[PDB]
Subunit: 210 residues, 2 copies
Amino acid sequence: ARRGALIVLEGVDRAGKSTQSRKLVEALCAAGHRAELLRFPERSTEIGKLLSSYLQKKSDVEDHSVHLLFSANRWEQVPLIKEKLSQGVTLVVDRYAFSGVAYTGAKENFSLDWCKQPDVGLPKPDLVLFLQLQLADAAKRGAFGHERYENGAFQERALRCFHQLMKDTTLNWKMVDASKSIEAVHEDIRVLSEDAIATATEKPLKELWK
Amino acid sequence: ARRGALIVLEGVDRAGKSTQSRKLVEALCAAGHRAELLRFPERSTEIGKLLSSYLQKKSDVEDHSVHLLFSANRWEQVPLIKEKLSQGVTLVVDRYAFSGVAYTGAKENFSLDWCKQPDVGLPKPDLVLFLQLQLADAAKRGAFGHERYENGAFQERALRCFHQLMKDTTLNWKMVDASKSIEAVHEDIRVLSEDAIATATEKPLKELWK
Ligand SMILES: Nc1ncnc2c1ncn2[C@@H]1O[C@H](COP(=O)(O)OP(=O)(O)O)[C@@H](O)[C@H]1O
Ligand SMILES: Nc1ncnc2c1ncn2[C@@H]1O[C@H](COP(=O)(O)OP(=O)(O)O)[C@@H](O)[C@H]1O
Ligand SMILES: Cc1cn([C@H]2C[C@H](O)[C@@H](COP(=O)(O)O)O2)c(=O)[nH]c1=O
Ligand SMILES: Cc1cn([C@H]2C[C@H](O)[C@@H](COP(=O)(O)O)O2)c(=O)[nH]c1=O
Ligand SMILES: [Mg+2]
Ligand SMILES: [Mg+2]
Ligand SMILES: [Mg+2]
């Protein structure tokens, strides 16, 4: 059976990830692909609830612990991800391990190396779209929410960490100009996704960062 | 202020860790030290409950996720551990990161390296007592419990992983002949502990595996 592709959308807050992930799944399904939507954090699980409470500031969680919970929250979906891909379903994922490293990396004394380790071995995305736009342009998209990390200084530090990660050529990173209109960004992402879905059927799923 | 020592007790199931940890705290306090008892997993926290449910077989947890939860369960106590040690309190800990690596390492496809990473940077123990005894002798101490890992094949594989870890000379590992009587084992551990408490006041707390 021809496997589905694992496509991840990354970027800072308000980059358009959730909008574009939803629209990409809709468009791929309308074009005859079997595509499904996933997101991280997956706030529905027991770990997910801990993470949601933390992000809402309803609880405080030690920084290393929360970093590990974010990773554990990905691992608990790995059996499902592998099964779906093997069944031929393409998975469009709103955030993945890259957000995990970039957001914890925005905290002092968290090396990129330590942050990556827990996620070493996850299913490696076939395509990582980075929805690029200036933080000042993202800032024009209404106001910051009230969750943790939703402030200018944290986003700036997370973006710099994403830039560091984009130096890993082991991954198929594709820059997307996320400053355009919702429909224009969508078309760019959809074309990239269709190419990746066709090529993913030619090579086995690999392991991230290993 | 003269810091307390961080003393960890490790070993296979039924090696006497919990008995000896309790008795060591009692004896140190009776000798005028400020010593407190800790254990991992710390089953009282939100993460701890997840871990307890898993160990009781009330739930299944993906292996990488549970490994990370075990580590997160240590990290969430790090601020407390650091504060207590700095206040001069010696902490006697029933299991730590070594058990975390040895038990997950008993599962195929879990490298020692990947298992160590989440715990890299925890407070480094001043003394790691390994309560050594043949698994066949441990087996004579009543019957195996009903929790996960409480069977001969898993314990054998975990012991082999502990042997691998004991090759790290970066740690002050001390072998204890845990086959002796409760009181004899206790005296050996108590003498080792008193020496370590005196020397811990001379050097700062370090970071594990880094
Ligand atoms: N291309 C775009 N131009 C303008 N506003 C946009 C664009 N894409 C999304 N938005 C709006 O910006 C906000 C953030 O979009 P969202 O998709 O939720 O981003 P993210 O998940 O990256 O935070 C929402 O109000 C959304 O409607
Ligand atoms: N030295 C010893 N000799 C014989 N039985 C022992 C000894 N130490 C502990 N035990 C008994 O063995 C069992 C396991 O001891 P415990 O301290 O709970 O070990 P652990 O925490 O390593 O599983 C308990 O019934 C305990 O009373
Ligand atoms: C997936 C993931 C998200 N995050 C953050 C990024 C966002 O600030 C936050 C909520 O995500 P969201 O913006 O997609 O709703 O979680 C981490 O800190 N680590 C992670 O592993
Ligand atoms: C601390 C720790 C324990 N364990 C295991 C060892 C025991 O089988 C189990 C319950 O511990 P206990 O024997 O000390 O009650 O948890 C792990 O698998 N990982 C860990 O990080
Ligand atoms: Mg979003
Ligand atoms: Mg015990
Ligand atoms: Mg390494």
